[PDB]
Design a protein around this ligand. Structure first.
Ligand SMILES: [Ca+2]
Ligand SMILES: [Ca+2]
Ligand SMILES: [Ca+2]
Ligand SMILES: [Ca+2]
Lengths: 212, 212
């Protein structure tokens, strides 16, 4: 039963967000606030902060990572690293999504293309006091690609690679596309990449720092 | 696409909680804070307050009810009306659960015993600053029983009746049992009842007031 998120109290993970041209747009910081033990597995409550490239905080809140029975799931905070999301955030923006599951390829092996073990999820963001500033990010058809080492500024991590489709709606536009993400035990998302339906890179994020 | 929760801004629903002997233990109050429209359906953010029989607030927070595509789901706040939950709550207690789905029997008819349309869910509660005060409520094997009118102090509502099993764990004890709930469009839970595995009534709740 692997836990795909940091789980030591006080531990802090930083992930950087980039434009397709490699420019830094945002910095996401998670800090483990509390880890609780349950017979069926663990519960981790973490604080998140989303800031811009100059370190100004755009949004902060709490999220949860958990193991129940054999199964790990967590809040969809990470899909908020999509540019549409990052660009509409401020202190009055809130978000709600499903807890999304992350299968353990490393113990339960999967063939490339396996998808029935991955659940779909929808994240909605909205500004309190300004309803027009809202968004919906739907992630679906997630499937296994491979397991492989990914090299990042925080180090080299053996990861599970997943491919997914997504729909992003705001009152001003619909964007359709696809993405990849790579995740690892005790870290969560190590790397992600977003594309439009023409296969043109829109953005990406990479694990930048682990502070235990 | 029925929405099983109040959805007019400002609307307020009160549900009363009782011991098996009919004594009032707690009062739960939901107030619709904001309703947001998305192409795929609606998002409702509501504030909840849990109080004791004398009106002293035990816990408050926010929760979400939503329609996405054809499917309604919501936070598991209502399973917090179990006595173990009610009795451990204070201002420093927080809770996290899955968004749990509520099928629309009224449009998509179900035969008694149908269960594959209902998802399982786990709610965990914990006190910040006092880890020993925590709990887990697992709800599973939910299935359709019937549709029928239920008479309450707020009125008579045509409801879907569901049966479920549950496991309740705290560091001091495990309780195993089963329950029934009745839900209706634009209200949510109209009535619920909890039993232990000997079929002895442990508690119940009934819709008390709708203020639009
Ligand atoms: Ca497949
Ligand atoms: Ca498939
Ligand atoms: Ca059945
Ligand atoms: Ca079945």
């Amino acid at each position: 039963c692997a836990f795909f998120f940091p789980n030591q109290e006080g531990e802090q993970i930083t992930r950087n967000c980039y434009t397709a041209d490699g420019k830094l747009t945002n910095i996401l910081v998670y800090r483990v606030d509390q880890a609780y033990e349950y017979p069926s597995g663990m519960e981790v409550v973490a604080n998140y902060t989303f800031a811009d490239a100059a370190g100004k905080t755009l949004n902060s809140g709490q999220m949860v990572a958990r193991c129940s029975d054999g199964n790990f799931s967590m809040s969809m905070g990470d899909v908020a690293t999509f540019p549409t999301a990052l660009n509409m955030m401020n202190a009055d923006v809130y978000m709600m999504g499903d807890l999304m599951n992350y299968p353990d390829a490393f113990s339960n092996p999967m063939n490339p293309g396996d998808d029935d073990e991955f659940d779909d999820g929808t994240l909605r963001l909205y500004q309190k006091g300004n309803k027009n500033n809202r968004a919906e990010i739907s992630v679906f058809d997630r499937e296994f690609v491979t397991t492989e080492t990914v090299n990042t500024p925080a180090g080299a991590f053996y990861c599970t690679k997943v491919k997914y489709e997504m729909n992003i709606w705001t009152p001003k536009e619909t964007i359709k596309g696809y993405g990849y993400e790579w995740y690892a035990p005790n870290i969560g998302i190590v790397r992600s990449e977003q594309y439009n339906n023409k296969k043109e890179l829109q953005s990406y994020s990479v694990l930048e720092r682990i502070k235990k």
